[PDB]
Curated annotation (Swiss-Prot):
Native organism: Escherichia coli (strain K12)
Protein name: Sugar fermentation stimulation protein A
Pfam families: SfsA, SfsA_N
Effect of deleting the gene: No visible phenotype.
Keyword DNA-binding in annotation: yes
Organismal lineage: Bacteria, Pseudomonadati, Pseudomonadota, Gammaproteobacteria, Enterobacterales
Length: 232
């Protein structure tokens, strides 16, 4: 997808209170951005990093600018606004960048199915229903990507739900959208949430497919393109 209109740049002073960031624009003035990420944002919010923000045109809200990307001091692009993940995924399924998910005749979003909600469900006359859970990956240590970047009991629960989907003979996919341009491989963060990492291995055992695709990212746009090796 393309950022429309294109993003503007600034220099980070600090992210604070989770949802706010003070930045300095190219004119040397201060500006407060909405930070649409509630997580730790490890490696994504270093004072002095360049940030890229969008502008909401027709709103009277207090902070009509949103922090979209970080361009780290080592030159890497990071999409900190992980609220784009589902859209990038849908776009990549439909344009067939994600080959493992081609050959379905319909795509539905936000499907409530059980006594739980799935990000996408793919369907076809000849095939079992395909359930896709989308996860965002912004944690990098050099080239190694990790999820989660803090313990997640909610993540653990959804992972268990996917196992039930597979057990019932549906196709079940967990899809890690990799939003940091430095990442070249993916693993669960066993060192951070050991239980999640264990559940991820167990889900694989029980037939949940695990994919990780990397986004190409610039101030102009982002697109999921490249598949990445996963090591449990
Ligand atoms: Na999700």
């Amino acid at each position: 997808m393309e950022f429309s209109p294109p993003l503007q740049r600034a220099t980070l002073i600090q992210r604070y209170k989770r949802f706010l960031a003070d930045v300095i624009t190219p004119d040397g003035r201060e500006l407060t951005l909405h930070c649409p990420n509630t997580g730790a944002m490890t490696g994504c919010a270093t004072p002095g990093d360049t940030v890229w923000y969008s502008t909401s045109d027709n709103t009277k809200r207090k902070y009509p600018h949103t922090w979209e990307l970080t361009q780290s001091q080592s030159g890497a692009f990071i999409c900190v606004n992980t609220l784009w993940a589902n859209r990038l995924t849908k776009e990549a399924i439909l344009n067939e960048s994600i080959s493992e998910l081609s050959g379905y005749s319909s795509l539905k979003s936000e499907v409530k199915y059980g006594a739980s909600r799935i990000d996408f469900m793919l369907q076809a006359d000849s095939r079992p229903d395909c359930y896709i859970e989308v996860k965002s990956v912004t944690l990098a240590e050099n080239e190694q990507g990790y999820f989660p970047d803090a313990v997640t009991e909610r993540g653990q629960k959804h992972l268990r739900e996917l196992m039930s989907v597979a057990a019932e003979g549906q196709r079940a996919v967990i899809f890690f959208a990799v939003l940091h341009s430095a990442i070249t491989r993916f693993s669960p963060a066993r060192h951070i949430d050991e239980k999640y990492a264990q559940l991820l291995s167990e889900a694989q055992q029980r037939g949940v497919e695990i994919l990780a695709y990397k986004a190409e990212i610039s101030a102009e746009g982002m697109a999921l393109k490249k598949s990445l090796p996963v090591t449990l």
